[PDB]
């Protein structure tokens, strides 16, 4: 359908002893396919999806080299940032980076991104044009000038519109059986009496993929927002996702309420009622 490939990197400094904790993960859509953890035994980029396992030794050598090198870039960064912000050597700090590309339903490039954060706040980000930088503050402005002189954006643009898209298409083909399969939500409603006068209706969506979904309540055919609760979409732990929406209603008036479920796996939205 429409698709994306993203990589996420986190480094956390350890002032008491040793080097930062480093964790990298790669995704195609909502499927994790690779990982690296500096605390793990292998010290290699590891597979996490059956369809990536077919890649040969030069793939795993190259990805391991790149991911370990990235960890050292972050190690240097943490020292430099402590200096930019005039901070002590005694505290723990965090660097985060995410980059990737989206393609359309025709598998052609739609957009690319590369974003960087220090201690959980925006630091520097590549603009949608893939040519310019957004620097949050004066420290990041210093970094911007350095990255301009090092031709960083040029390289990233080339990757995001080229390699990124090309390998995403490759993965989509190799992992067709699951990556190009949509799992429609299995839906049902439960009823929970609160008193003689009131009850909670809860609308369930289970075992769905991809994660994107919309749940809405209506009363007599109009959207209702009062007395509703909507939980964050959550992983089931088997590759799929779950979500629910609930509403409090006068006991005996349950038939007025309808739950509406929208998902890429559904040709038209579903309507549920008690």
């Amino acid at each position: 359908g429409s698709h994306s490939m993203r990589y996420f990197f986190t480094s956390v400094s350890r002032p008491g002893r040793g080097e930062p904790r480093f964790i990298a993960v790669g995704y195609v859509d909502d499927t994790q396919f690779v990982r690296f953890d500096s605390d793990a035994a292998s010290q290699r980029m590891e597979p996490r999806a059956p369809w990536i396992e077919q890649e040969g030794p030069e793939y795993w050598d190259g990805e391991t080299r790149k991911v370990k090198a990235h960890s050292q870039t972050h190690r240097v960064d943490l020292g430099t940032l402590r200096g930019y912000y005039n901070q002590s050597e005694a505290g723990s700090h965090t660097v985060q980076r995410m980059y990737g590309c989206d393609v359309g339903s025709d598998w052609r490039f739609l957009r690319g991104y590369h974003q960087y954060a220090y201690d959980g706040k925006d630091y520097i980000a590549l603009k949608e044009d893939l040519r310019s930088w957004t620097a949050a503050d004066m420290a990041a402005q210093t970094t911007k000038h350095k990255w301009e002189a090092a031709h960083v954006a040029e390289q990233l643009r080339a990757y995001l519109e080229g390699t990124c898209v090309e390998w995403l298409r490759r993965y989509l083909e190799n992992g067709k059986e699951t990556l190009q399969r949509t799992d429609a939500p299995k839906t049902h409603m439960t009823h929970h009496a609160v008193s003689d006068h009131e009850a909670t209706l809860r609308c369930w969506a289970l075992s769905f993929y991809p994660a994107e979904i919309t749940l809405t309540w209506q009363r007599d055919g109009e959207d209702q927002t009062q007395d509703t609760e909507l939980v964050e979409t959550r992983p089931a732990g088997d590759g799929t996702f779950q979500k629910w929406a609930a509403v409090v209603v006068p006991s005996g008036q349950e038939q007025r309420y309808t739950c509406h479920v929208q998902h890429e796996g559904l040709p038209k939205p579903l309507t549920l009622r008690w």
Partner: peptide
């Protein structure tokens, strides 16, 4: 497949 990120801040 990853990009190369060699330039520090």
């Amino acid at each position: 497949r990853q990009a190369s990120l060699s330039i520090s801040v």
